[PDB]
Structure 1
C-alpha cells in the first residue's frame, strides 16, 4: 500500500479541469508543466520568454514548497521552448534557481504552447531526506 496525495497551492496557478498541479506518489512528485502565468491574474506575465521563465520556475517553487520540498529535490526537468534561439537566455535564468547537484534535463523547441506561452517547464522531484552522491 503506497500513499498518493494531490498537491495544491494558491501560490501557483489553479489547476482548472481534469488535472492537478502536482501528484505525490510514494516518494516521487510529478509536477504538471508550468507556464509563466501569474497565480492571481491567471495571465502570462509581460516581458517575454525571460520573465515567463522566471515565473514558471517561481510557480514550480511554490508547488515544491507545498510538498515540503525545494529546488534541491528536483531530479529531472523538461524545458519546452517556443523558439530554440531562446535556449541560452532561458538557461541563464534556469541556473538562478539551482546551486549544485543539478537535475537531469531535456530541452527543445515545440511547435506551440498553451496560451501562446514562450516556455513551459515540467519536473519530477523526490521527497527528502536524500543522501547525495
Structure 2
C-alpha cells in the first residue's frame, strides 16, 4: 500500500535558489497532520510521498536529485531506510548521500532532505 502526501504549506515547500531546489526536511506527515502508522519503512514511504509532492511543485523529480540526506535517531535503523530508499533511487542514484543521527520531532523515526536540479 502506497499513500497520499500531506498538503504542502509555505514552510514545508523548500526553497529554489540559483536553479537548485532544497527541500525542507520532509517528515512522515499524512494529510491528517499525524505521523503515519507503521514501523520505520512505512514512515519512509510517507517521507517519499512528501518528497515527490514538493519536488513536483518545484519542477523537479527523483531523477534530478543530486543529494539526499537521511536524518534518524538511531544509526541502527539505517538499513531498513536504505531498503526503502532503493525503490525510489534505483536506476538513478544521487551522486552524494549522507546519513546523520538527530533529534527528530515527536513520533518521527526518519526525516529526508534532498537537493535537486530544476530543469
Which TM-score applies when normalising by structure 1? 0.78
Alignment of structure 1 residues 117-128 onto 2, 5 Å? 117-128=108-119
- Structure 2: tracts of 5 or more residues without a match: none
Alignment of structure 1 residues 1-133 onto 2, 5 Å? 11-15=5-9, 19-38=11-30, 40-103=31-94, 104-110=96-102, 112-128=103-119
The ranges of structure 1 where at least 4 consecutive aligned residues each deviate by more than 2 angstroms after the TM superposition are 11-16
Which TM-score applies when normalising by structure 2? 0.86
**Rg larger in structure:** 1
Equivalent pairs, count: 114
Backbone CA RMSD of aligned residues:
1.6
Cα distance, 1:20 vs. partner? 4.3
Q: Relative contact order (C-alpha < 8 Å, sep 6+): which is higher?
A: 2
Does structure 1 conserve the Cα–Cα contact (< 8 Å) formed by 2:6 and 2:33? no
Structure number having the greater strand percentage: 1
Cα distance, 1:60 vs. partner? 0.6
- Structure 1: tracts of 5 or more residues without a match: 1-10, 129-133
Separation in 2, partners of 1:33, 1:108: 13
Separation in 1, partners of 2:69, 2:12: 18
Name the SS for the 1:115 alignment partner.
coil
